[PDB]
Structure formats: structure tokens, C-alpha cells
Design a protein around this motif. Structure first.
Motif, PDB file in Angstrom:
ATOM      1  N   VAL A   1      92.636  -9.401   9.670  1.00  0.00           N
ATOM      2  CA  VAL A   1      92.657 -10.167   8.431  1.00  0.00           C
ATOM      3  C   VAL A   1      92.617  -9.253   7.246  1.00  0.00           C
ATOM      4  N   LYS A   2      93.108  -9.746   6.125  1.00  0.00           N
ATOM      5  CA  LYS A   2      93.153  -8.984   4.878  1.00  0.00           C
ATOM      6  C   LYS A   2      92.002  -9.448   3.931  1.00  0.00           C
ATOM      7  N   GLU A   3      91.217  -8.497   3.427  1.00  0.00           N
ATOM      8  CA  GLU A   3      90.096  -8.836   2.544  1.00  0.00           C
ATOM      9  C   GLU A   3      90.586  -8.899   1.120  1.00  0.00           C
ATOM     10  N   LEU A   4      90.830 -10.108   0.609  1.00  0.00           N
ATOM     11  CA  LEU A   4      91.454 -10.244  -0.729  1.00  0.00           C
ATOM     12  C   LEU A   4      90.564  -9.696  -1.862  1.00  0.00           C
ATOM     13  N   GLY A   5      89.245  -9.857  -1.743  1.00  0.00           N
ATOM     14  CA  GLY A   5      88.380  -9.356  -2.799  1.00  0.00           C
ATOM     15  C   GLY A   5      87.722 -10.425  -3.646  1.00  0.00           C
TER      16      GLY A   5
ATOM     17  N   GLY B   1      86.334 -13.406  -1.974  1.00  0.00           N
ATOM     18  CA  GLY B   1      85.611 -14.246  -1.046  1.00  0.00           C
ATOM     19  C   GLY B   1      86.498 -14.699   0.108  1.00  0.00           C
ATOM     20  N   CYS B   2      87.800 -14.435   0.037  1.00  0.00           N
ATOM     21  CA  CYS B   2      88.750 -14.936   1.032  1.00  0.00           C
ATOM     22  C   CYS B   2      89.276 -13.885   2.005  1.00  0.00           C
ATOM     23  N   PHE B   3      89.588 -14.347   3.214  1.00  0.00           N
ATOM     24  CA  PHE B   3      90.206 -13.499   4.222  1.00  0.00           C
ATOM     25  C   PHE B   3      91.551 -14.174   4.594  1.00  0.00           C
ATOM     26  N   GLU B   4      92.635 -13.417   4.533  1.00  0.00           N
ATOM     27  CA  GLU B   4      93.961 -13.951   4.877  1.00  0.00           C
ATOM     28  C   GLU B   4      94.366 -13.390   6.224  1.00  0.00           C
ATOM     29  N   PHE B   5      94.434 -14.259   7.221  1.00  0.00           N
ATOM     30  CA  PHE B   5      94.581 -13.846   8.615  1.00  0.00           C
ATOM     31  C   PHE B   5      95.934 -13.157   8.862  1.00  0.00           C
ATOM     32  N   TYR B   6      95.994 -12.320   9.901  1.00  0.00           N
ATOM     33  CA  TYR B   6      97.250 -11.687  10.339  1.00  0.00           C
ATOM     34  C   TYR B   6      97.848 -12.438  11.500  1.00  0.00           C
ATOM     35  N   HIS B   7      97.271 -13.591  11.825  1.00  0.00           N
ATOM     36  CA  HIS B   7      97.772 -14.408  12.922  1.00  0.00           C
ATOM     37  C   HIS B   7      97.581 -15.840  12.519  1.00  0.00           C
ATOM     38  N   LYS B   8      98.158 -16.744  13.299  1.00  0.00           N
ATOM     39  CA  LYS B   8      97.933 -18.156  13.101  1.00  0.00           C
ATOM     40  C   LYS B   8      96.522 -18.506  13.551  1.00  0.00           C
ATOM     41  N   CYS B   9      95.796 -19.217  12.696  1.00  0.00           N
ATOM     42  CA  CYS B   9      94.390 -19.536  12.973  1.00  0.00           C
ATOM     43  C   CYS B   9      94.170 -21.016  12.763  1.00  0.00           C
ATOM     44  N   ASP B  10      94.158 -21.759  13.867  1.00  0.00           N
ATOM     45  CA  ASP B  10      94.146 -23.198  13.823  1.00  0.00           C
ATOM     46  C   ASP B  10      92.719 -23.640  13.785  1.00  0.00           C
ATOM     47  N   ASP B  11      92.471 -24.940  13.912  1.00  0.00           N
ATOM     48  CA  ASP B  11      91.130 -25.470  13.701  1.00  0.00           C
ATOM     49  C   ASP B  11      90.107 -24.955  14.707  1.00  0.00           C
ATOM     50  N   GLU B  12      90.550 -24.729  15.933  1.00  0.00           N
ATOM     51  CA  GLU B  12      89.688 -24.158  16.957  1.00  0.00           C
ATOM     52  C   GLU B  12      89.341 -22.704  16.607  1.00  0.00           C
ATOM     53  N   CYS B  13      90.350 -21.949  16.194  1.00  0.00           N
ATOM     54  CA  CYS B  13      90.151 -20.586  15.794  1.00  0.00           C
ATOM     55  C   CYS B  13      89.122 -20.533  14.650  1.00  0.00           C
ATOM     56  N   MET B  14      89.333 -21.375  13.638  1.00  0.00           N
ATOM     57  CA  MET B  14      88.478 -21.446  12.462  1.00  0.00           C
ATOM     58  C   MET B  14      87.045 -21.741  12.882  1.00  0.00           C
ATOM     59  N   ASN B  15      86.864 -22.764  13.702  1.00  0.00           N
ATOM     60  CA  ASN B  15      85.539 -23.103  14.177  1.00  0.00           C
ATOM     61  C   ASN B  15      84.835 -21.919  14.849  1.00  0.00           C
ATOM     62  N   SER B  16      85.584 -21.131  15.613  1.00  0.00           N
ATOM     63  CA  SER B  16      84.991 -19.932  16.213  1.00  0.00           C
ATOM     64  C   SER B  16      84.603 -18.896  15.156  1.00  0.00           C
ATOM     65  N   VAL B  17      85.348 -18.831  14.056  1.00  0.00           N
ATOM     66  CA  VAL B  17      84.971 -17.916  12.987  1.00  0.00           C
ATOM     67  C   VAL B  17      83.643 -18.385  12.338  1.00  0.00           C
ATOM     68  N   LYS B  18      83.524 -19.701  12.102  1.00  0.00           N
ATOM     69  CA  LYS B  18      82.338 -20.271  11.479  1.00  0.00           C
ATOM     70  C   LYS B  18      81.066 -20.182  12.346  1.00  0.00           C
ATOM     71  N   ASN B  19      81.185 -20.207  13.666  1.00  0.00           N
ATOM     72  CA  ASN B  19      79.980 -20.137  14.507  1.00  0.00           C
ATOM     73  C   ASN B  19      79.725 -18.781  15.191  1.00  0.00           C
TER      74      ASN B  19
ATOM     75  N   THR C   1      91.044  -6.065 -13.852  1.00  0.00           N
ATOM     76  CA  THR C   1      92.287  -6.842 -13.797  1.00  0.00           C
ATOM     77  C   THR C   1      93.368  -6.059 -13.088  1.00  0.00           C
ATOM     78  N   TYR C   2      92.972  -5.199 -12.168  1.00  0.00           N
ATOM     79  CA  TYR C   2      93.955  -4.385 -11.490  1.00  0.00           C
ATOM     80  C   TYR C   2      94.982  -5.213 -10.687  1.00  0.00           C
ATOM     81  N   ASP C   3      96.215  -4.754 -10.717  1.00  0.00           N
ATOM     82  CA  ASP C   3      97.276  -5.460 -10.042  1.00  0.00           C
ATOM     83  C   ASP C   3      97.597  -4.821  -8.688  1.00  0.00           C
ATOM     84  N   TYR C   4      96.965  -5.299  -7.623  1.00  0.00           N
ATOM     85  CA  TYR C   4      97.268  -4.786  -6.285  1.00  0.00           C
ATOM     86  C   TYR C   4      98.780  -4.874  -5.896  1.00  0.00           C
ATOM     87  N   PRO C   5      99.357  -6.091  -5.920  1.00  0.00           N
ATOM     88  CA  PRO C   5     100.756  -6.266  -5.514  1.00  0.00           C
ATOM     89  C   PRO C   5     101.735  -5.360  -6.260  1.00  0.00           C
ATOM     90  N   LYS C   6     101.480  -5.100  -7.534  1.00  0.00           N
ATOM     91  CA  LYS C   6     102.353  -4.205  -8.290  1.00  0.00           C
ATOM     92  C   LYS C   6     102.509  -2.809  -7.690  1.00  0.00           C
TER      93      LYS C   6
END
Ligand SMILES: CC(=O)N[C@@H]1[C@@H](O)[C@H](O[C@@H]2O[C@H](CO[C@]3(C(=O)O)C[C@H](O)[C@@H](NC(C)=O)[C@H]([C@H](O)[C@H](O)CO)O3)[C@H](O)[C@H](O)[C@H]2O)[C@@H](CO)O[C@H]1O
Ligand SMILES: CC(=O)N[C@@H]1[C@@H](O)[C@H](O[C@@H]2O[C@H](CO[C@]3(C(=O)O)C[C@H](O)[C@@H](NC(C)=O)[C@H]([C@H](O)[C@H](O)CO)O3)[C@H](O)[C@H](O)[C@H]2O)[C@@H](CO)O[C@H]1O
Ligand SMILES: CC(=O)N[C@@H]1[C@@H](O)[C@H](O)[C@@H](CO)O[C@H]1O
Ligand SMILES: CC(=O)N[C@@H]1[C@@H](O)[C@H](O)[C@@H](CO)O[C@H]1O
Ligand SMILES: CC(=O)N[C@@H]1[C@@H](O)[C@H](O)[C@@H](CO)O[C@H]1O
Lengths: 485, 490, 490
Positions: free
Chosen positions: A448-452, A454-472, B477-482
Motif C-alpha cells: 500500500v501507498k502511504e498518502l500522508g 491518514g489514508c493508505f491506497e492499496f496495490y491490490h484489490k481489497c474487498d470487504d473481507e480484505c478490509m475487515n481483516s485490515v480493521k481487526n 504544500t509540496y507537490d508529490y505528483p509533479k
């Protein structure tokens, strides 16, 4: 994706912390009691003795103006108006008066008993009175009290009483101080007289002290009263060659402890309290209050403070650990069953799920914090207001310095404790969110990618079962190790 | 290209203690313990003390001739005495309820003597009687405020009264003379079997003289016993005596502005102003604590048994040639060259390099630490108090109770002061550590894999980052994608 | 091949409380509440107490025959009595200012009974009178230090004697007056009616007349004896004069004082041990700031609290198999196998495995926690105090004021001691958690992508890591480039 978030709401509650003023929080708990019920009440089932505008001396001597009084047989404290109108109607003084008041401040039983019937003073005149005690308006006298020469002689006045009443007995007597030697002779015939009273433990004598004085309630004369506690089965002996003002009655008394006198115009109103103030009673679990310093009962600590608010919830964003209002920029009003949790998004939908494990652990922690602050506060019975005579100014000031001293300690500690614990509560929440964030981070690794934010963007498909495993906490990393990176 | 995160260092050698660690050098600190005084005895809120020198309050009110040029002021907020005043009852004897009298006049706003019983109207008695005990130059003399002996061979009953028309409560003192022997009694008063009686609306007293041999004090076996009362406005005092009465000539009008205390010191007044006076000098401070002297009068800091209470305000000082692990940790040391902030960045690109404070974190820390200090200082209550008290030698228990009270609060305040300082300093150092770690992460989470974490607070860019780029990093405000020029990495 | 970060665990069942959590098991702890004493009555800083047993102070100084050769010490630091002494005024009466007098002799640097007025020198009076109230075996007797003056034949002439204190020290002197039950008694004993007792020194002047009046019999007697006392200054003189009813001292007591102390009520007797802090249950010897043994102490004592327990965590949470998320967090359990430190590593490779403490971080934590325990203990100011006080039955308000003061301090110290423990315990556990987190990140930042971060405190190497290599990780010298050519396969 899956994102870590925290609760927000519509709260406008403000708290202060050691580092920051007026922080808005989602929830807070006021620990300062500021309200009362506006009533005079019974204490633990027992009413106060209500003296109206009679003084304790006026009541016990029997000032005629205190006749329609109504004296309960048992009381937990005493209520007086601030400056009683009816006290020593025949002017004078009352020895160790504040000690007497302190003694009868709370009693389990009180009962007036006729101990020396006045008609048994068979060789003195007994009818003497004064316009200063006037009724209706003929001369009268203290109703509980009684001696002048008979014909032209005043033989020794000698009588005794054995307290066979079964309880200790309060007994008052007095000596009259005439205007001049001529009045001394007129009333008592002899000059150079004395009043002696003796028990097994008290030996007291007064002699007349004659002086020229202005009129008080119309009289230049004075009467000076004294009192004792006669123990069960002991004898009180009265012996006087003149000037004695004898009791006819004594007061059976049983004490279960001491209490105090409360100055107020208020009257008893049929309710129950454990803590009474002159403004009204307080019914509270909170450890502090600012209603009134002169309380009677089992009360919170009086502090000089307008506000003591503990934060319980988190900063409301509709910290040391950098997440709340940090890299996670705002709260979620949409997450209603937890302080902390997740929002997810995939092919099957989105999004909110509260984290019950870390939410509950936090609630428990903050419950303990609050319980600790409130419960550790000791609360024993005390009566704050005290009685001092005009020659005990130094002692009254000592008591004041002590009360002032404790008021400073408690106000400062209460204000500082709230500020310090509020800082720590905010950081506690901040830490809980950080830890939940890292819990996910450490599960996902490079899947997964750490956006910065609070969010993580997965590198794979993560369906509801997958998600539930992440939460527990059971996310299967190897299973999805194919990266698409 | 690179950007590094770091923190302020300087040449400070100030030391503080913390709960976990002693003698930590910090970049800035603030002492909250007031240790200095001005060496002066001062006015308190514009109002001077009455300065009695080596006269006692008895000696002063009675009019001991040795107190004559005492210089009494109209108004006073405390009283200054030497440690053991030498001029008191020049003719020996006692003073009933003296301490309660001292307490009452400790702070007054109008003080005025009134000649309530002009001595010249004692027309049927001699009025000039005196003693070598109270000698003046070096003739027999007497308390100037007081006055009675036989005229020829007669002492008619002495009888005079006074109605307090003065408009204020009045302090009135009188005494009785206890002679050494019957011959003294007859010489002075002719009559034997005498009395002194005094009455008001609330006072009633008749005293009879005690004739007995006693050791000589200032030459006298006789004694004089004084008593005092307050006469209410419009009330009357009546004196009657067949002998042995020491009459007042004057009374004193007293309006009390609360209550204060007596300060024992050799110092004299000095045209300076203060809110807090000690026998060593006056204290002028906003600080919550002091260690100067326990016997203060005024609105004073809390007295503690401490020699140092130092709050960290800056961070650990780590000049170069904690909970969060940044300061003196993964970022090895501080930067003396960064002077416009507590935390910031050092950068290096094609254009140059490169210190810059992070104004956001820096302002956070300024506001937070100012709030912390203000909290510790402002939340302290400071009410007027006169610490030193007067107790007679038969009131040792009461004196001891006062002492136990003062000792108790001293131990409370000292322990809480010392611990608060240790605990808050621990939190302060951790607060700065946190702010540095947070700044580092703020940069790290923006840059993600467009830069490499070089370790020591530093990031090396996988792309060209000009000044404009650096600003976006610095303000968040750094632009990562850029920037996928970044295959430099692979 | 891998290396894991972990922390010490053991089989401690020691519990503490924190602000957030109750009953947490920790690896190590220390109570700061002193709960033990030596069960004995001791010398206080080298000096014994005066042991009065079942005599009262009055019984002793007057010489009630049952308190006779009571066996004293020339010097004492406090006084021990039974709760309810049997022997006091065997002839009934009272003592004026008795509590003040008890408080005066509570601690003395010297005390010596001296014969000041030999009874044989009352040549004009009878001196042998006694009472059945004081009966000895079983003839009438009397207080052995006093002289009951009665008539000689049918005469009681003026009794007059004086004494000059040439002893070198201040001297306690006591005297009394007899208040008979009736006129017959007055005449049998003293012949005269209308008598008086007069006593005078340089500062004392007292005249008393006897009060003849019928009273209930106490110890067979309706009469009473009323006693008074004074301190006679060096080289001052005391004059006694009486026409009847004087109870004269035969002796006085040289006394030197260096402070005051108090009376302890207990059945215990002195046992040849030493202490700075006596309780009626036994003496305390502690550095601790708080105790709960008994509120009535004498000496320099910890602060008394109504706590059963005040336990500071010193070790970490015991998780046999936090703000910073490692302890009982992503590192789910502790290691009983790591015995030489609080935090460390478990390694596994070709050569085996694999426990080793991180000495440096362990020692840093030990230093920190040692400073914390010392801080809480060392900052407590302690002073000499005697808590138990004497008040008469007309001093209830004063006794209540004393009680309110003690209850007030009891409330302050209890609340603050308890919360201090809770608060510091929360910080101590987080401090350990942070130490583990920091150790963990140090390994992380070293290994970088030459290893897999599993997420349970373990790192799995993408290369073979022998003991030498494992060691470089442990001590911060891992060589990333060296194994870079190998790691991951890639
Ligand atoms: C008994 C009687 O009638 N005596 C005449 C006095 O009344 C009288 O002086 C006036 O007394 C006025 C107060 O009178 C009383 C009172 O207190 O009301 C009258 C009471 O009956 C008397 N009670 C007794 C004697 O038991 C009471 C008592 O004597 C005094 O209070 C003792 O101090 O006095 C008031 O004092 C007036 O100022 C005074 O003139 C004199 C003169 O009228 O003659 C007495 O026979
Ligand atoms: C007025 C006169 O000549 N008095 C002679 C007495 O003094 C004397 O007894 C001796 O008195 C000595 C003290 O002398 C004074 C004093 O206090 O200085 C003299 C003062 O005038 C006198 N004050 C008066 C009379 O108002 C003062 C006073 O009498 C006493 O203080 C009252 O207690 O005495 C000193 O005390 C000697 O110890 C004492 O013998 C007698 C006897 O000699 O003759 C008197 O004439
Ligand atoms: C002091 C006195 O005489 N008190 C008596 C006591 O002696 C007696 O035992 C009791 C019998 O009624 O009455 C009471
Ligand atoms: C030993 C001696 O004679 N000297 C003193 C003397 O100075 C003093 O005046 C007297 C008290 O009256 O006590 C003695
Ligand atoms: C065993 C090993 O890895 N070699 C080195 C060792 O030579 C050095 O002394 C140590 C630091 O003390 O670090 C490591």
C-alpha cells in the motif's frame, strides 16, 4: 483505499490546558459544583434547632420574648439570624459563652427539667423582676431563673441538686451587680456578699462588682451568668450570702459530636441534605464547589474558582503525537459509534467503521482518570463557621489565616490539576489515533501507498473481507504480495 | 539537493533539573523563585508604618517620658518595633489583655487623641504625683497620658465621667496602684480599704488594691496594673475611686482599616513603595514563590524552603562544532546558526543554502511555553497577610499552634513547588522533542519516496528542488505528483 | 536470519495503579509509604523521655506519695504517660494554667529539684498536717514537695518568707490555696477568718482569698486546693505572705529549655533504642516522605496520610508470554529469557540464538527512574513537631481548631500523595514504552531495505547475518552498503 480517522461533533465546549486556552473538545466534564437548592434542610435526617432572632442565651435563660420558640429534642446544627434581637434582656454578660454554644451545637437529646422548684426558697423573696424584661408591659424576668431579702433579712441561700436524670446536665446561674452600695442593701441587706457554686469538678465563686454605669434596656444594673455540665450522679451545691440568680431548671443533654451555628434568615423546608450552606443545600458528587465558604456537613472542597472543566473527549476538529489536527487534518462527523476508526473505499462501497477496541480502551482510561480525580477526595463532616468573643480577635484571625491557607492550596492545586490533566487527555487521544494508524501501516507494508493524510491506497484489490481483516489486525500480507508497483 | 530538519542551539550554560535527569543545560530558562529584596523598610500601598523604635505599644499609649518624641502619624498600615523594646512600663506592673490591644491598633486610618478627662478638673485631688522610676532630668515624673493622690490630708471620693462625643469608638486605658505597704497607702491616698470602679454600657469592673511587699523594679515595690476598653460612640464611661486610681487624661479614637501586624526590625522607613514587606527589606515581584524571610506583611508570594526554582523555557542545549527520540537523538545536535526560531530547516540546492525557521512550529512553542509559565504564575492566589503574631508567655500553646500552621503550609508549598518544577521541566523538554519529531515527519510524509531519508534529520531529494520547491516543503504544500523525475531512484 | 526487539518480563505479581488504569502488574516496584516501625519507645536524638507511667505531671511536681521517688532523668526530650493516669491531685482541686505548664516542661536540657524553703524554718506554724485523701499505709499524708501550714496551738500569725533565686537557672515554683468545705474546718486548721494568700516576684503579683463552701466529697474531702505556678528568674526574689490557707512549696525546680515537645500517651516503656521519630506504637526510621502508622508522632516524621498503599512503578508493565505503542502493543509480549536488562534483542542465524540486553538504553532508564524515585523522596521537607496537644475542658473550640488544622493537612497530603503516585506511574510506563520504541527505530533506520519489517518487533534479513553482523546492528555500526550487494536477491 482505507483511511484512519477520529470523531468530531457539533460541540462547543471549551477547556484550558497547561499549553493552550479555549480548546474546543467533543465532550467535557465539569468538576466544580456551582448550584444549590435554595433551601434550609435536615442533615442526615435531623433538623437544625431554629432560634429565629433569639440568641442561645436568650433561649436558655428564658427571655420572655423567646417563649413561642419550639425546641426540638434533637438537632444536627443551629440556625440563627445574623444579629439576634433577644438575648440578655436584663443587661450583662455570660462567662465562657462561646464554649457553651459550641457544646450544644449538635445533640442527640435535649430536655429541660425542673431541678430546684422556686417555691422551696422559703426564706427569700423570689418574685423580683425588671422592666428590662417587661411583658405587656409589667416587670418580668428570665423565665428559667429566679433572690432578694425577705422582710429585711437575707439568710444564707443554700440548696443542692443531685443529677439523677440519667444524662449530663447543663446548668446556668448568675450574679447581680447592683448600681451602688445603697441598692445592694435594699435588695440583699448585706454588703460584701458572694455566690459559690461547687460540684465534684467545678469550684467557682463570683462577688458583686459595683460601678456606676449608663442604662442598658433602661437599667444601670447588670447580671453576669456562668454555666457548668453536671455529670450523672454528681451534686451541684449553691451557696450565697446574696446576689445569687438561681436556676430553676437544668437541661439534660446527650452529644453525638460537634457541629456549628449557621447565620441566615432562611427557615427549615423539609428536605434532606448532607451538605448545607446559608444560601441553600448542595447535593453533589463533584469534589469542589464555590457556593459559600461557611458550610455544614460532608461537603466538597471550597475553592476560589469560576470554572474547572476536565476534557474527556478529543479536540473537536469538524498534539504531541502529530495526528489529530496534524497529518490527519480534520475529524469525521459521520463516525458516530467511536472516537477512532476507519473509512474505506473499494468496488463494493464506502465507508465508516468505528474501532471498538481502541475506543473502549480509551473510554475506560478516561473514566479512570475522572474517577481518580473525584473519588480520591476525602469528605468528612465539618462545620466551618466558628464563634469568637471580642477579646479573642487573635484566635479568630488564626482561624482565618488557616482557612485562607487551605483555600489557597486547594484553589491553586485544582486549577493546575485540570490544566495538566487536560493537556495529557488531548495527547492520549492523539496517541491512540497515531497508534491505530501505525497498526494499519505495519500490517500493509509495501502492499500500500502511504498518502500522508491518514489514508493508505492499496496495490491490490481489497474487498470487504480484505478490509475487515485490515480493521481487526489479521491482514494477510503474503497473500496479496504481488504489488502491481 | 537536500533539506535537513533541526533545532536551535546557543551559548547558554543555564541548568535545570527534571524528574528523570539532573543539571540539563537548556537554551533558555526562567527562575520562579524571588530571592532579592531592596534592603529598605517601605510604605505599604502608600501608607507608612508607625515606627515605635525602642518603645513598646504600652509605653507609647501610656506616655512613658522616654517615648515623648515618638512622632505619631495620622494613618498606618503596620507597626515597626525593635526586637525587645526597652521603654514600656517605666513604673512596673502589668497590662491586662495587652496582646488583644496590640492586635486591634495594628492598622488604623484615623487616629486622634482626645483629652477626655482634663487633669485640671481633678480640683479636689493632687495631680502632680510622680516617680523616679519614670524620672525626667532627673526629677520624678509620670506617664504623660495618665494621672491621683490626696490633697493635703484628704482624698475625697473621686468621681468623673465622659460621654464619647468624638464621633468614633474610643480606646481608654486606666490603672490601679498596688502599694508596697500600709504606710505608702496612707501617704498617697489617706483612705484605706479603697476601690476603683469603672462602668460603661458593656464594661463593669471594680478592682481593689493589693498591698504587699515585692522586690523592687526600677526602685519600686509597688505595681501598676492597667486595663483598657473601647467606648462606643455616644456611650458613657464612669470612674469612681476612693483611692489608688491611675486615671487616663486622654483617649484615642480608632477607625480600623482591617488588621495587620507588628514587624520587628532595626530598620527605619525610607520613602519607597511596596506590596510586600519583610524585616530585611521589601519584595517587588510577580513570582509565585520567595525565600527571603517568613515574617512578611502584605500581599506576598508563598514562602518556601528552597534556594532555586528554575523552569526550562527553551530546549536542551546541544551546540555542535527524550520521549520522542529526535533532540540529542536521531538529530544529533542543534544549530547555533539558526537564530530566528526554535525549529527549522537547512537546505542546499543549485541556488545556495540555507537556514530557515519553521514559523508555525516555532510560534506553537512560543505560545505554549508562554501559556505554561503564565499558568504556573497567574493561578497563584496572593491575599494580604501579617505573618508574625503576638502571644504572651502564658499562651505558648497558642503560639505553637500558629507555628504548626505556618510550618505545615511551608512544607506543602515547598514540596509542591519543587515537584511541579521537576515535572513541568520534564514535559517541556519532551514538548520540544515532539515538535522536532513532528516537523521531521511533516517533511517525510509529504516527500514520500521522492526523497531518501539520509539519517541525522536530513533528506536527499531524488529530484531538483529549487528555492520555490523548498518553500512548498517548508510551508507544507509540496507537490508529490509533479516530481516523477524520480526514476533517478531506480 | 533475523533480529527482534523486545523487553524484560519476570514472575513479579506486583500491582500499581495509574491515572488511566488500575492493578497493572509491573516487573519491579517500590512503596514510598512507610508502614513499619520497630515496636519500641526510644531515645529521641539521643535523649530519653521522662516516663511518668500512671502519674500526672501535677501528681509528680507536687509529690503525690504515689509519684514519690518516681525516678527521673536530669534531661529529657518528651514525656510519656498512660492515657488515663491514676495518680494526680489526691487532695482534690485544680491547677491554674496547667496545660501551659505541661507544655513548658515537655522538653528540657536540665531539670533539678532544689530545697528552697526548708519546712522546719516555718517556726511559728505547724507543718505536719496531712489528709486521709492522700493516705499512706494508712496514715494521713500530703503532697511531699509542699507544706500544709496550719495553726500552732490556737494561733496562726502572719506567715512570711521569701527566696532569692541564686541557683543559676530559672526556677519553677508552685504554691496553692486551700478552699475549705466549711467554717468549722477553716477555724480548726487556721483559727482566723477572712484570710488571704499573697505571692509576688518582679513580674508576678497575685492575691487570693479562700472560698469556704460546701461541695461534694472527692476522695472524702469537700475542701479543694487550688495550685498556681511561676518561673522565678535568676536572681529574682519570690515573697510569700499569708494569714491562713497557704499551701507553701518546700522545693523548686531549676529548669533549662532548648525548645518544646509534647506528651506521648502509651503503655510502652523505654527500650534502649534511638530514633528521630517516635510513635505511641513504636519508632519509625525511614527516608520515605509518607507514613500511615499513627497520627500522634513526636520528632521529624514523614507526612501522615490515610493511604494503605503508595506504590511507584519502577520496572515496566509485566507482559509474561502505552503512548508509544510498543510495549503490550506491536511487540505483544515480554521475554523472561532476557535477564540482564530491561530492553534488548533476540537474534537467530546459522550459528544459533539469541538473547542480549541493550546495556546503554537499560542503564539510561535505570538512571532516570532512580532520579524519579529520589526526586519524590528527597524534595520532602521535614521538621520537628509534636502532634499530640493538651487542651482543658473549657478549650473545646481551640481543641477543634487544632483538629481542623490536622484534618486539613491530612486531606491535602493524602489527596496529593495518591494522585502523585497515579500520575507518575502513568509516565513511568510510557517512559519504558518510549525507550523500546526508540531502540526499535534505531534498528529500523540502520537496516533500511536490507531487511523486512515484519511488524511485531522482528526484522528479517534479506542477507545472511552472522554473529559479527548481528553485533554491529546491536551496537549501531551495521554496514548497509556491505550487504547491499546481496540483500533481497535484488
Ligand atoms: C423594687 C422597687 O420598686 N425599687 C425602686 C426602684 O425601682 C427605683 O429606681 C428605679 O429603678 C428602675 C428599675 O427599677 C427596677 C427594674 O429593674 O425595673 C424595679 C424592679 O422592681 C427592681 N427589681 C427588684 C428590686 O428585684 C429593679 C432592681 O432594683 C434593679 O434593676 C437592680 O439593679 O429595679 C431604674 O433603675 C431607674 O433608673 C431607677 O430610678 C428606686 C428609685 O425609683 O426606688 C426603689 O425602691
Ligand atoms: C513623696 C515622698 O517623699 N515619698 C517618700 C517615699 O518615697 C518613701 O518611700 C521610698 O520611696 C522610694 C520611691 O520614692 C518615690 C518614687 O517612686 O520615686 C517618690 C515619689 O514622690 C512617690 N510618688 C508619689 C508620692 O506620688 C513614689 C511613690 O510613693 C511610690 O512609688 C508608691 O509606691 O515613691 C522607694 O520606693 C523606696 O523604696 C521607699 O522607701 C517614704 C519612706 O522612705 O517617705 C516618703 O516621703
Ligand atoms: C455526690 C452524690 O452524693 N451523688 C449521689 C451518689 O453518691 C449516690 O450513689 C446516688 C444514689 O442515688 O445519688 C447521687
Ligand atoms: C547573691 C546576691 O546577694 N546577689 C543578688 C542581688 O544582686 C540581687 O539584688 C538579689 C535579688 O534581690 O539576689 C541576689
Ligand atoms: C563485533 C563487531 O560487530 N565489531 C565491532 C567492534 O569491533 C566494536 O568495538 C563495537 C563497538 O564497541 O562495534 C562492533
Amino acid at each position: 483505499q482505507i483511511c484512519i480517522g477520529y470523531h468530531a461533533n457539533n460541540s462547543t465546549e471549551k477547556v484550558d490546558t497547561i499549553l493552550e486556552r479555549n480548546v474546543t473538545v467533543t465532550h467535557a466534564k465539569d468538576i466544580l459544583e456551582k448550584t444549590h437548592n435554595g433551601k434550609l434542610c435536615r442533615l442526615s435526617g435531623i433538623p437544625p434547632l431554629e432560634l429565629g432572632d433569639c440568641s442561645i442565651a436568650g433561649w436558655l435563660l428564658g427571655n420572655p420574648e423567646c417563649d413561642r420558640l419550639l425546641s426540638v429534642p434533637e438537632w444536627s446544627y443551629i440556625v440563627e439570624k445574623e444579629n439576634p434581637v433577644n438575648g440578655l434582656c436584663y443587661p450583662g454578660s455570660f462567662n465562657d459563652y462561646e464554649e457553651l454554644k459550641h457544646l450544644i451545637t449538635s445533640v442527640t437529646h435535649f430536655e429541660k427539667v425542673k431541678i430546684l422548684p422556686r417555691d422551696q426558697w422559703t426564706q427569700h423573696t423570689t418574685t423580683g423582676g425588671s422592666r428590662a424584661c417587661a411583658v405587656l408591659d409589667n416587670p418580668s424576668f428570665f423565665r428559667n431563673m429566679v433572690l432578694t431579702k425577705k422582710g429585711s433579712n437575707y439568710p444564707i441561700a443554700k440548696r443542692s441538686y443531685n443529677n439523677t436524670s440519667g444524662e449530663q446536665m447543663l446548668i446556668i446561674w448568675g450574679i447581680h451587680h447592683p448600681n451602688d452600695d445603697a441598692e445592694q442593701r435594699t435588695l440583699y441587706q448585706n454588703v460584701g456578699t458572694y455566690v459559690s457554686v461547687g460540684t465534684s469538678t467545678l469550684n467557682k465563686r463570683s462577688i458583686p462588682e459595683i460601678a456606676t454605669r449608663p442604662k442598658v434596656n433602661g437599667q444601670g444594673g447588670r447580671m453576669e451568668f456562668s454555666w457548668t455540665l453536671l455529670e450523672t450522679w454528681d451534686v451541684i451545691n449553691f451557696e450565697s450570702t446574696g446576689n445569687l440568680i438561681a436556676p430553676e431548671y437544668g437541661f439534660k443533654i446527650s452529644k453525638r459530636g460537634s457541629s456549628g451555628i449557621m447565620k441566615t434568615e432562611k427557615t427549615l423546608e423539609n428536605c434532606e441534605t448532607k451538605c448545607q450552606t446559608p444560601l441553600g443545600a448542595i447535593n453533589t458528587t463533584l469534589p469542589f464547589h464555590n457556593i459559600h465558604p461557611l458550610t455544614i456537613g460532608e461537603c466538597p472542597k471550597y475553592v476560589k474558582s469560576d470554572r474547572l472543566v476536565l476534557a474527556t473527549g478529543l479536540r473537536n476538529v469538524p498534539g504531541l503525537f502529530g495526528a489529530i489536527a496534524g497529518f490527519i487534518e480534520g475529524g469525521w462527523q459521520g463516525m458516530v459509534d467511536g472516537w477512532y476508526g476507519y473509512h474505506h473505499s473499494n468496488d463494493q462501497g464506502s465507508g465508516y467503521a468505528a474501532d471498538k477496541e481502541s475506543t473502549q480502551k480509551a473510554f475506560d482510561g478516561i473514566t479512570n482518570k475522572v474517577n481518580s480525580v473525584i473519588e480520591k477526595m476525602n469528605t468528612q463532616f465539618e462545620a466551618v463557621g466558628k464563634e469568637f468573643s471580642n477579646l479573642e480577635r487573635r484566635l479568630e484571625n488564626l482561624n482565618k489565616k488557616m482557612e485562607d491557607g487551605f483555600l489557597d492550596v486547594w484553589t491553586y492545586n485544582a486549577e493546575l490539576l485540570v490544566l495538566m490533566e487536560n493537556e495529557r487527555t488531548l495527547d492520549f487521544h492523539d496517541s491512540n489515533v497515531k497508534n491505530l494508524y501505525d497498526k494499519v501501516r505495519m500490517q500493509l507494508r509495501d502492499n500500500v501507498k502511504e498518502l500522508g493524510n491518514g489514508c493508505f491506497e492499496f496495490y491490490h484489490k481489497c474487498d470487504d473481507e480484505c478490509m475487515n481483516s485490515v480493521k481487526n489486525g489479521t491482514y494477510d500480507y503474503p497473500k496479496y504480495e504481488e504489488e502491481s508497483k
